[PDB]
Amino acid sequence: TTFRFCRDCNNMLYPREDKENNRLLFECRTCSYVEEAGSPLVYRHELITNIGETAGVVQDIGSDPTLPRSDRECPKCHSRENVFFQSQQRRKDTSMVLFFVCLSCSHIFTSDQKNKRTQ
Amino acid sequence: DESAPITAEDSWAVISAFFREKGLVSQQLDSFNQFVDYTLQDIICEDSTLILEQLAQHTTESDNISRKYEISFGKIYVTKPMVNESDGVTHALYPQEARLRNLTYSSGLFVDVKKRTYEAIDELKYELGKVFIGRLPIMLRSKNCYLSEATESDLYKLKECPFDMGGYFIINGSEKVLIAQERSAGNIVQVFKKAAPSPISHVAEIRSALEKGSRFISTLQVKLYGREGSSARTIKATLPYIKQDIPIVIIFRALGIIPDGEILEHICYDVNDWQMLEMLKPCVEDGFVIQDRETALDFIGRRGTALGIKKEKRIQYAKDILQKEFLPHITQLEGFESRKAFFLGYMINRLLLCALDRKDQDDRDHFGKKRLDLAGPLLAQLFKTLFKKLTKDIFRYMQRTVEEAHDFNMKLAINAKTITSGLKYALATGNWGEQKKAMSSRAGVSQVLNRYTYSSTLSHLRRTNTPIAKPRQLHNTHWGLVCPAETPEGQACGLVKNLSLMSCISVGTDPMPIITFLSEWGMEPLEDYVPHQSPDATRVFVNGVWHGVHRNPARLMETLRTLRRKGDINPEVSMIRDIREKELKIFTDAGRVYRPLFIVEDDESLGHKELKVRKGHIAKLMATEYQDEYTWSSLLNEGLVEYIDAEEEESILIAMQPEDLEPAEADVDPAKRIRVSHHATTFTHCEIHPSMILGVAASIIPFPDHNQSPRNTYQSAMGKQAMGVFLTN
Amino acid sequence: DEDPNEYNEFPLRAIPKEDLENMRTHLLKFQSKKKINPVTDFHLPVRLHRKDYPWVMEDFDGYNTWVGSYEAGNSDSYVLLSVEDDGSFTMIPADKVYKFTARNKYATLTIDEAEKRMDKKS
Amino acid sequence: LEPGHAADQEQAKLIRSAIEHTTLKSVTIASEIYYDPDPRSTVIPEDEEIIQLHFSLQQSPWLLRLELDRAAMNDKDLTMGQVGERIKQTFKNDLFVIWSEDNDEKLIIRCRVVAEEDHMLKKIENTMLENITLRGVENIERVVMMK
Amino acid sequence: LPHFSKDDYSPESKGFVENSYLRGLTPQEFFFHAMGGREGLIDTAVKTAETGYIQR
Amino acid sequence: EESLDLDLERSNRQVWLVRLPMFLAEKWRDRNNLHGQELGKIRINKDGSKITLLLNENDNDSIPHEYDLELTKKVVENEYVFTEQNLKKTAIVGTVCHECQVMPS
């Protein structure tokens, strides 16, 4: 989604349709502000989420002693130095796929041999 | 070769030192001492001074005279134990005479009192010793007890047994042991899913209470209305003294954070995270009605209370509730809206984080989130209600004696028997409360010390009671802190915990030296936080009070750790760094159960990651063992060993054996048990000895590693009923 | 080290003790969102009054009003540094910092009526 | 099972499918609300092909677009046709439904109604996920086959 | 336990007691057996009154 | 003057806002007003803009330690300084052109 606020109010924006020119706007319900929409998408639900998997990957991730290490060669820098964890999306369903974070290039690679990622 | 790695037998030389110093009841004594040396004074100074003002009728002489009288409480004194015989004479009293003549082993409580007088005519206030207040029972072997600085031969002449360990009181001649009471730690943010049939799907709770001073047990609930699949999922919060749950938005507005997005900035810290933000749109719609700070306070003020009809009245209320009853930890002061707003926002962040299935529901049974109220705090709780009982009986007197000008006689004013018999009652009977009119009061807090066998006495001074999710089960967090076998069979099974040998309980220190230290070490104060400017900022807490943020925690954490390992920051203080969650929580807090572990450092010029303690320290200790200059404190200040509570345990990585779990591989005995490996290169700490996970009773079980789990649980119950010499006296 | 470079250093008059407003130098802070422009023909006038104490700021009628509230303190403190024509600096401690703290407005003939409608809701 | 078809595993599956409860929620990846003002031409270039057909061989400019999971649509055996049919038969002539073919890469259902419409569609998507029953009998979840 | 790395689903991590009683238990094996052992003592304790009232 | 009025920021006078450590301010108080309370001097170094604060020798007996300053942004905010005199007149003295923090040394 990614929504905007009113400059002047800082209050949130409500969508208004410009019936005449068939176009979407964003009105402020505290002042007389109006701005045209960036995207046609107003609301996104998302039931089968993937946002949470690689959360809290601070560059300090290597400083956690609790995290386990592996000798897996990186897809980028080919470094056999990396820390690993499972999908941080705390759901029942969730697969046991592993996320490896490079102790040099910091690139996040997975063990998923069914699908190919970029997060 | 004084810097050679330590063997497995050497861990006993450290354990020897731990016990040479601490003894078996350090928890019981260290608690009481803290209460006598510090806690006692602060209880006399919280409410302390009381005033009575007599303003005239302003008719004519003898009217038109306005006065104000003061009564102040200064330093508090406490004698060695004494006794007031029938024939007036007061003299010292030793533990043996107490037990035989059924007396109480108590000492005198004395407080400096001052009585000022002031006066005005028809605005300008112009001015016109040490009193006994009660007898406080002493815990044996404490600082105040005669037996504390007593040598072996000394005790024998005193007809006491040197093997006796102290840790009890003597009330009317019977020994009494305060049992540690287990409660959930306060000022703690916890998110819980509210069950299938409920309007509210998840709740963020905070049991806010003061470290000392009245202790407002006001628990704030931040409720997520609507269930997983219901439209209009709003967030409302139940505020103390307010009947209804106010939509979060109005609270922020009443706080001063007026526009949406300024409000949203306090809740969601990532401008990217659309998922959490969509979840806030309903709240914004809910709070759309109220647009300024005033109208927000009226809306809060409307919803009583009772209602308290009058416009000026309701808006004035909401001010007071937000100041005095809403989030009372942090501050109860005035201009701290910014601090309490960011906290509420941190709570909503956690509420939504769990509902978005990114975090797990809080484990209500994590030992790190539990506190143990020992002899110290128990007496502190009782003394508070007992001193406010005395304070308000003196006031009742100051009225009675200003009416008839009967000369404010001190002895008539202060009733000694109030605090004396008020404590004697609790300790005797065991109903921890005021007084002969007790219920609900908690019975069994104080009980008669088991003297069947010596082990029976020891295990009674390490007993824990838990009153009222799955409490009886042995939790992982109980490792090294509580005995896995020593628990009763039936009704109390798993609700009566027994402390492991090396377990100690945090006495409670001062947070300010750490808050002062933090700010000076790169900690940006919350009052000036701008979430989107510093978005990766590690949020720093000291006793569930969010103080600010820090940009390079890596270096700060190392400084704080070096501060502790030096002694500059007390060793009983807990500090944890959850990298993934971007948080640094600090605990100066009383009641936390801790255990000592060996420190391991990657730091070794020659080779790998190795245990700080070397064969040279070990001989340095056994030199002092032969002398009966290198104590347990010596290992602690030399940062070789450290104290780790359950919350801190979460972030460490421990090796069981040092030698067996340190150098890697460059035939094997079949009779020995199958063991794992030292695969970890990450090891932060090492286990002094794994047998230390056991309590007093289980520690007499030979080969408990060769018995079926409950057979061990049985022995740690029977040995308490086994005959033998209990004391040499 | 040696200074091959030049530094311009100005004498700082640690706060003069005796000043007419030695006692009060305060900070009035506005959030950028408020978009207050001091150079406004309209904002030529301005009145600052204690509300009986938050400060109340108001322009001529028809213009926005702001409320000023005091921020919490800390160990460090702020000083205002001003420079004289001669380079010397004079520093003055900030007495208080206020976050302002104004109006909107469009809050008349409403609020109480909207809540009532909301109640006609439950 | 019925006397005859007692050893027939395929008959067991048929009943399993006919009884085990299935909701539009269990098949949906995500639902989206878009402003697509021309009913005949789409702002989403993906969907461009779905229109080109479900038109050849008046309504709201607000679009409810939901993506279904192929893997999920299979375990609880279902077709885009049959899923769409349920929605169509639920909202009758007050909702205009189109759907991407079972063959087509992404699985999509485009819906439109027949001033003020934003909240209206958010109600329609809740009805859709929570109240629309595809297969099965109510109260009957997790149906296992057993020998 | 704090002696293990995170996301360890190994038998040794989730409570598999590899050894015989004759051989002896490792501290980890000992504590896990203790957790499992405590569970039975809890039901023995509870069942006792629940079972009693059913009888009545 | 005009009662309840605010004074003159229109002149666009600029001032700097500096955060100082409590200990330093404590030292500054020591300086005598009669002296004019000259606490020390501010150094502006080039080759990059570096600003530091050094205490006067009189203030302490040792080698004066420079306190580095971290320059900071105005932030999305407008900061103005207003003064209230004993007379209680209120004046809008200046706008904060630059913000800085004096680090402890």
Added chain:
RNA sequence: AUAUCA
């Protein structure tokens, strides 16, 4: 009232 016993 706590502790305990099978």
